[PDB]
Amino acid sequence: KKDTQSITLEELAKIIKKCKHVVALTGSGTSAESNIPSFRGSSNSIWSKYDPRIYGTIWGFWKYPEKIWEVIRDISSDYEIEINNGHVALSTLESLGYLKSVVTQNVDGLHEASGNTKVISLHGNVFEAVCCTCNKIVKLNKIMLQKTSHFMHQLPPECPCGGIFKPNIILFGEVVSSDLLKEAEEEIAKCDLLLVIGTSSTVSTATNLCHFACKKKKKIVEINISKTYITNKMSDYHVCAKFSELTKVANILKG
Amino acid sequence: KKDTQSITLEELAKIIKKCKHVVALTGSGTSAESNIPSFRGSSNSIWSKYDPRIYGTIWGFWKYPEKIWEVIRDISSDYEIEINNGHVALSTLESLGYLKSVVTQNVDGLHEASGNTKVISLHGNVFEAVCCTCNKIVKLNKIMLQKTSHFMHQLPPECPCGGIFKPNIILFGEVVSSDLLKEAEEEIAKCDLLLVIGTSSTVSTATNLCHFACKKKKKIVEINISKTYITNKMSDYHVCAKFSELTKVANILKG
Amino acid sequence: KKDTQSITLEELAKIIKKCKHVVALTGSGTSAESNIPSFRGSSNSIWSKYDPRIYGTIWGFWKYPEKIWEVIRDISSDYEIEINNGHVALSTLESLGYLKSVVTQNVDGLHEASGNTKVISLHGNVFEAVCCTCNKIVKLNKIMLQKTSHFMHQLPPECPCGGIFKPNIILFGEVVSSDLLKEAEEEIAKCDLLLVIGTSSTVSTATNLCHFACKKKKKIVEINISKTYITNKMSDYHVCAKFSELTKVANILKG
Ligand SMILES: Nc1ncnc2c1ncn2[C@@H]1O[C@H](COP(=O)(O)O)[C@@H](O)[C@H]1O
Ligand SMILES: Nc1ncnc2c1ncn2[C@@H]1O[C@H](COP(=O)(O)O)[C@@H](O)[C@H]1O
Ligand SMILES: Nc1ncnc2c1ncn2[C@@H]1O[C@H](COP(=O)(O)O)[C@@H](O)[C@H]1O
Ligand SMILES: [Zn+2]
Ligand SMILES: [Zn+2]
Ligand SMILES: [Zn+2]
């Protein structure tokens, strides 16, 4: 427990200006304004439409591997998924020489698409698939994820060997690999500021990385439309703002 | 592997008398005599009545959030849940200046109700709920958990923001947060005796905390109606007694 | 990321000849030639026949404890399960004084049956069961696992106390215990070579043990019919061979 003081976007800017190695921790909050639904119970959740028991678990995948591809296929095709100002904001913060890494739980690859250089994907990424028998990795893209694509024509997509392609994202019942977790630890260890942007709703890999940050005495700044699990627990400051309002911050540090 | 020697309640008393910083690790065994059912396959289990696949998992909650509230509501209302002698025993052991902390896996808050001061709740606690969209925390009590209460009138209970209240307890598919685990580690690290009371049936957070205790060369005493996973593995002594027979021990150290 | 160079069986032999403390990490790949099906989506998988949601999870066990015993009973009875050359190969490598431990994820106990001495069973073992109320451990064998055995006559098998026997293997929703994980760490820590044989298909306990191995700068050799998750990530060399082709290696080092 500790005191988390609310500050303003312009106050945050003043904090960042002094720092030299900023890391951003990002969850579904950073993608909401790109029309990507969340994956918990946040009202804007994907689980309105699909049963998580069947569509989101490894044992659900083992028995009905097509279903998670229906999910991915539908989202890619039916929603106007594009970069938002927050992503442009972050990208320019990296261009300005302050933001060094982004550890994300998002599977949409938007940070990278924004022009950030070092993106650690805790929950994997929807643009890789892996054959479940021969381990062939195939890198995908928007076009191959479309409902009319050849790749999507027969579900589940099949490897040349005859095996079944699994999307390279963490499902319910899978743990994040140790080495990926360490890459995230290693980046936080050497940071002088941590932005927890649009995440920490609930205990998760991200919460634990925030705890790690406290243990390492790192200044934490929370940017979120609401309070969260780490507020008055591990975060030092809180900025109540939507992700896209970060352009307010990028503009100031540009001048 | 090692030798776990069975001792008597009065032998245990002689051990405690010499110690200065006792920590108790407690599971469902400490609540059984308060008519709280267990949550495994121990015959007195809650899963006779409810399907764990639907009533006890986060993905089960995401799709049917009312169900776990039916569970909590029914238990609170239909069983005579009260403190037992074991809880009074522990409370007086803390009053006598020997017992410093209790790490529990129980979600019933009985230890606290007993008058213990430092209770670390590994699996959360049934007297807090959290809005799944705005993260508002609401502290509950017996009265609000009753089937006739306003809080329980519409399920799932709704936050003012319009969001859905989730009970603050660990479900199947959720991991215990790192910081909560550390608070438990930190307490064991500085203890000179560990009482594993009414738990360790199976590999669990509690088993791992016992392993941690061995690694830190701490004297472990098991109190349980039967042998368990840590017996002749990590525990140094075993007292075959029901939780409520601890008053035999408290009475002796009182004089 | 790093370079994994493919080598030959005879090249591997030349590597082993120089080492003094070899540890083998083994998964379902080592048992495939004994007709034991895998437990993922590898085409030869057990989940063709059974629903993992009901037959393979702890919550599935709590509600329908007979089902996993049907699984074990059917496999034991209907498949010609015997040691293969790879197991004989490993056993002789331990006889030749090179191979010191085997950390396995397999639940079939074949390594031990091969005549290896130190087998650490990450996912438990199908030849122990434990009463879910009194924790009585019963050691089983082939004969007791047969469909006509007394043990298998009434499912789930019942403990004398009246409780229900649970097979001593890790199910979906259970974590590997810390102390078992440490025994595996401790063995790798002091090894000078690690053979990842027939495993590492996907992120798992085994992958994490490979990561641990890198962190400890240990030479890793992969033996598998295909590439895997650790290839060009953590493994130093790769031998593309079936498990049973290890006799080629054992024969050379025998002379
Ligand atoms: N546009 C947004 N900007 C910032 N945070 C958001 C936005 N939309 C949702 N959130 C937050 O993102 C978090 C999502 O957490 P999680 O679903 O656990 O990754 C919640 O705490 C939301 O309050
Ligand atoms: N009245 C009691 N006193 C002490 N131990 C108990 C009592 N009732 C059940 N137990 C034990 O509590 C443990 C429950 O373990 P778990 O369900 O894993 O928390 C089992 O090992 C039981 O033998
Ligand atoms: N006969 C065999 N010899 C060696 N590796 C095998 C054999 N059969 C299957 N495999 C491999 O074993 C691994 C199984 O991984 P997992 O199912 O994750 O334990 C896969 O990478 C397969 O390519
Ligand atoms: Zn393939
Ligand atoms: Zn709310
Ligand atoms: Zn029994």
CATH of the domain at A64: 3.30.1600.10
Residue B118 and residue B93 in contact, taking contact as beta carbons nearer than 8 Å: no
Instruction: Return the closest-CA partner of residue A136 out of C232, C7, C228, C5.
Output: C228
Q: Which residues pair with B7 in a beta bridge?
A: B239
- Chain B residue with minimum CA distance to C182: B211
Number of domains in chain C: 2
The amino acid that residue B103 corresponds to is: V
Beta pairing, strands C5-7 & C237-240? parallel
Verify that C22 and C136 share a domain, yes or no.
no
Beta pairing, strands C99-104 & C22-26? parallel
- For C128, the domain range is 36-82+124-175
- Residues in contact with ligand 3 by the CB-under-6-Å rule are C 27-29, 32-33, 38, 40, 42, 198-199, 201-202, 204, 224-226, 228, 242-243
Instruction: Return the closest-CA partner of residue A169 out of A129, A134, A202.
Output: A129
Verify that C28 and C68 share a domain, yes or no.
no
Residue B220 and residue B206 in contact, taking contact as beta carbons nearer than 8 Å: no
Verify that C96 and C193 share a domain, yes or no.
yes
Let me know if C123 is a catalytic residue.
yes
Q: Is C198 annotated as a binding residue?
A: yes
What are the residues of chain C with a beta carbon less than 8 Å away from any beta carbon of chain A? 40-43, 45, 47, 51-53, 56-57, 172-173, 201-203, 207-208, 211-212, 214-215, 226-229, 231, 233-234
Q: How far apart are CA B97 and CA B91, in angstroms?
A: 10
Residue A251 and residue A96 in contact, taking contact as beta carbons nearer than 8 Å: no
Q: How far apart are CA C234 and CA C241, in angstroms?
A: 19
Q: How far apart are CA B34 and CA B27, in angstroms?
A: 13
Read off the tokens for B183: 């608070």
Instruction: Return the closest-CA partner of residue C235 out of C190, C181, C196, C209.
Output: C196
DSSP C158: B
Task: Pick from C135, C136, C159 the residue to mutate for probing ligand 2's pocket: most ligand atoms within 8 Å of its CB.
Answer: C135
Any idea which residue has 């061979």 for tokens?
Answer: C241
Instruction: Return the closest-CA partner of residue A67 out of A76, A79, A54, A58.
Output: A54
Verify that B76 and B89 share a domain, yes or no.
no
Q: Dihedral sign, CA of A163, A165, A168, A172?
A: negative
Q: Which residues pair with B37 in a beta bridge?
A: none
Any idea which residue has 């909650």 for tokens?
Answer: B61
Q: How far apart are CA B64 and CA B49, in angstroms?
A: 17
Whether residues C229 and A133 touch (CB distance < 8 A) is answered with no
Residue A75 and residue A36 in contact, taking contact as beta carbons nearer than 8 Å: yes
Read off the tokens for C75: 């496999």
Q: How far apart are CA A52 and CA C30, in angstroms?
A: 34
Any idea which residue has 């303003």 for tokens?
Answer: A8
Residue A234 and residue A220 in contact, taking contact as beta carbons nearer than 8 Å: yes
- Chain A residue with minimum CA distance to C54: A59
B163: left (phi over 0), alpha (psi -120 to 50) or beta: beta
Q: How far apart are CA B157 and CA C136, in angstroms?
A: 43
Cis amide prior to A156 (ω within 30 degrees): yes
Distances (CA, A) of A201 to A54, A129, A194, B158: 24, 28, 17, 17
Verify that A2 and A49 share a domain, yes or no.
no
Q: A154 C-alpha vs ligand 3 centroid, how far in Å?
A: 26
Please count the other Cβ atoms lying within 10 Å of the Cβ belonging to residue A217: 6
Cβ-Cβ pairs closer than 8 A, B with C, add up to 66
Residue B197 and residue B30 in contact, taking contact as beta carbons nearer than 8 Å: yes
Whether residues C234 and A173 touch (CB distance < 8 A) is answered with no
Q: How far apart are CA C189 and CA A89, in angstroms?
A: 45
The dihedrals phi and psi of B198, each to the nearest 5 degrees, come to 60, 50
DSSP-assigned letters across all residues of C91-116: HHHHHTT-EEEEEE--SS-HHHHHT-
**Chain A: nearest CA to B59, how far in angstroms?**
6
Domain's final residue, options C156, C175, C194: C175
Domain's final residue, options C175, C194, C210: C175
Residues annotated within the binding site of A for NAD(+) are 27-47, 105-108, 123, 198-200, 224-226, 243
Where does residue B3 rank: exposed (0-12), middle (13-18), buried (19+ CB within 10 A)? exposed
Integer Rg of chain A from CA: 19
Counting every residue written for chain B, the total comes to 255
Please count the other Cβ atoms lying within 10 Å of the Cβ belonging to residue C215: 13
The amino acid that residue A18 corresponds to is: K
Q: How far apart are CA B230 and CA B205, in angstroms?
A: 13
Any idea which residue has 């065994």 for tokens?
Answer: B29
Verify that B106 and B223 share a domain, yes or no.
yes
Give residues preceding each break in chain C, C–N over 2.5 A.
Answer: none
Distances (CA, A) of B36 to A46, B247, B252: 35, 20, 28
Residue C139's Cβ-side half-sphere holds a number of Cα atoms within 13 Å equal to: 1
Distances (CA, A) of A156 to A19, A70, A209, C2: 47, 9, 34, 31
Residue nearest to ligand 3 atom 17, measured at CA: C28
Q: How far apart are CA B176 and CA B179, in angstroms?
A: 9
Q: Residue A31 CA: which ligand is closest?
A: 1
Domain's final residue, options C143, C175, C207: C175
Give residues preceding each break in chain B, C–N over 2.5 A.
Answer: none
> How many contiguous H segments (helices) and E segments (strands) does chain C have?
10, 10
Q: What CATH number has the domain bearing residue C241?
A: 3.40.50.1220
> Most C CBs within 10 Å: which of B2, B40, B170, B215, as the mutation test of the C interface?
B40
Q: Residue A131 CA: which ligand is closest?
A: 4
Q: How far apart are CA C126 and CA C108, in angstroms?
A: 6
The dihedrals phi and psi of C168, each to the nearest 5 degrees, come to -85, 60
Distances (CA, A) of B130 to A30, A41, B77, B120, B140: 22, 11, 22, 19, 11
Non-local CB neighbours of C81 within 8 Å, separated by 6+ positions: C34, C35, C36, C75, C108, C110
The amino acid that residue B186 corresponds to is: E
Verify that A102 and A209 share a domain, yes or no.
yes
Verify that C90 and C153 share a domain, yes or no.
no
Q: Dihedral sign, CA of C208, C220, A163, C245?
A: negative
Verify that B169 and B51 share a domain, yes or no.
yes
B208 contacts on C by Cβ (under 8 Å): 177-179
Please count the other Cβ atoms lying within 10 Å of the Cβ belonging to residue A85: 16
Residue A120's Cβ-side half-sphere holds a number of Cα atoms within 13 Å equal to: 24
Q: How far apart are CA B27 and CA B195, in angstroms?
A: 11
Task: Pick from B87, B224, B233, B240 the residue to mutate for probing ligand 2's pocket: most ligand atoms within 8 Å of its CB.
Answer: B224
Residue C16 and residue C98 in contact, taking contact as beta carbons nearer than 8 Å: yes
Verify that A163 and A129 share a domain, yes or no.
yes
Verify that A160 and A247 share a domain, yes or no.
no
Any idea which residue has 């951003």 for tokens?
Answer: A24
Q: How far apart are CA C195 and CA C188, in angstroms?
A: 11
Q: How far apart are CA A245 and CA C91, in angstroms?
A: 64
Q: From the alpha carbon of A200, which atom of ligand 1 is closest?
A: 18
Select the residue of C202, C208, C231 nearest A178 (Cβ to Cβ). Answer: C208
- Chain A residue with minimum CA distance to C233: A179
The dihedrals phi and psi of B191, each to the nearest 5 degrees, come to -90, 155
Residue nearest to ligand 2 atom 7, measured at CA: B29
Q: From the alpha carbon of A39, which atom of ligand 1 is closest?
A: 17
Q: How far apart are CA C58 and CA C45, in angstroms?
A: 20
- 3-state SS assignment for residue B29: helix
Instruction: Return the closest-CA partner of residue A48 out of B132, B63, B158, B156.
Output: B63
The dihedrals phi and psi of C102, each to the nearest 5 degrees, come to -130, 115
Q: Which residues of chain A form beta strands (DSSP E)?
A: 5-7, 22-26, 99-104, 119-121, 124-131, 137-139, 165-169, 193-197, 220-224, 237-240
Read off the tokens for A134: 């021969």
Read off the tokens for A129: 């698939």
C196: left (phi over 0), alpha (psi -120 to 50) or beta: beta
Instruction: Return the closest-CA partner of residue C122 out of C190, C201, C180.
Output: C180
Verify that B232 and B134 share a domain, yes or no.
no
Read off the tokens for B160: 């003012």
Whether residues A135 and C173 touch (CB distance < 8 A) is answered with no
Residue C187's Cβ-side half-sphere holds a number of Cα atoms within 13 Å equal to: 25
Q: Dihedral sign, CA of B208, B211, B216, B220?
A: positive
- Residues A47, A49, B151: CA angle, nearest 5 degrees: 55
Residue B161 and residue A193 in contact, taking contact as beta carbons nearer than 8 Å: no
Q: How far apart are CA C61 and CA C80, in angstroms?
A: 27
Burial annotation B153-188 (CB, 10 A radius, 16+ → b, else e): eebbbebeeebbbbbbbbbbbbebbbbbbebbbebb
DSSP B1: -
Q: How far apart are CA B17 and CA B97, in angstroms?
A: 10
Chains in contact with B, where contact means 3 or more Cβ–Cβ distances below 8 Å, are A, C
CA C134 to chain centre: 28
Distances (CA, A) of B220 to A245, B215, B240, C42: 54, 12, 14, 44
